[PDB]
A paper describes a structure:
RNA ligases of the [name]-type play an essential role in tRNA splicing, the unfolded protein response and RNA repair. [name] is the catalytic subunit of the pentameric human tRNA ligase complex. RNA ligation by the tRNA ligase complex requires GTP-dependent activation of [name]. This active site guanylylation reaction relies on the activation factor Archease.
To discern between the different conformations and oligomeric states, we crystallized human Archease (isoform 1; UniProtAC A8K0B5) and determined the X-ray structure at 1.84 Å resolution. The electrostatic surface potential of Archease is predominantly negative with a slightly positive region around the N-terminal helix. Residues 22–47 including helix 1 and β-strand 1 are located at positions equivalent to the swapped elements in the dimeric structure of human Archease. Helix 1 and the following loop possess high B-factors suggesting increased flexibility in this conserved region. No metal ion was bound in our Archease structure, unlike a previous structure of the PhArchease dimer, which harbors a calcium ion. Formation of the [name]-Archease complex, as presented here, is only possible with the monomeric form of Archease due to the sterical clash with a strand-swapped dimer. While our results do not exclude a functional role of dimerization in vivo, they support the monomeric form of Archease as the functionally active state.
Numbering used by the authors: 22 to 179
The structure:
């Protein structure tokens, strides 16, 4: 939860809220993200939105521009890692993109390939509430469950 300007509240009211299927467990130097959904694809996209949700109130981001992230791994855990790593790099460099919403179109469970898409705009300290900088994705405790109730767990450094 953040404190919003009047302008930020107005943008949040103009766009549909994103359903939140994630939660945080805070520690001194890192945070565990837990995300879930009806599909593994939904658990992945919720994990990405949980990550960006730690940096700002993504409800205040306008869905002006579209950005695609495609990636591969050697298993589902490393696929998740590189998926989050690539989205974090879209934010931290180049176009400094912050997604309001992320969608995972497909995960190839055989080859560990993924296609995803996000809608958003350039991050800006004046338009977007300041949250906490995500310094890195860590790989020490990736967890992926891909049975009846898909869910993922990841630790990010702050």
């Amino acid at each position: 939860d953040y404190n919003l300007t009047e302008e930020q509240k107005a943008i949040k009211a103009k766009y549909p809220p994103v359903n939140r299927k994630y939660e945080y467990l805070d520690h001194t130097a890192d945070v565990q993200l837990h995300a879930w959904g009806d599909t593994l694809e939904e658990a992945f996209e919720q994990c990405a939105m949980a990550m960006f949700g730690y940096m700002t109130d993504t409800g205040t981001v306008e869905p002006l521009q579209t950005v695609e992230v495609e990636t591969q791994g050697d298993d589902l855990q490393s696929l998740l890692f590189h998926f989050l790593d690539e989205w974090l790099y879209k934010f931290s460099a180049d176009e400094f993109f912050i997604p309001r919403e992320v969608k995972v179109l497909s995960i190839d469970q055989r080859n560990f390939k993924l296609r995803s898409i996000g809608w958003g705009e350039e991050f800006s300290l004046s338009k977007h509430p300041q949250g906490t900088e995500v310094k890195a994705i860590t790989y020490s405790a990736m967890q992926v469950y891909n049975e009846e109730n898909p869910e993922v767990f990841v630790i990010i450094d702050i």
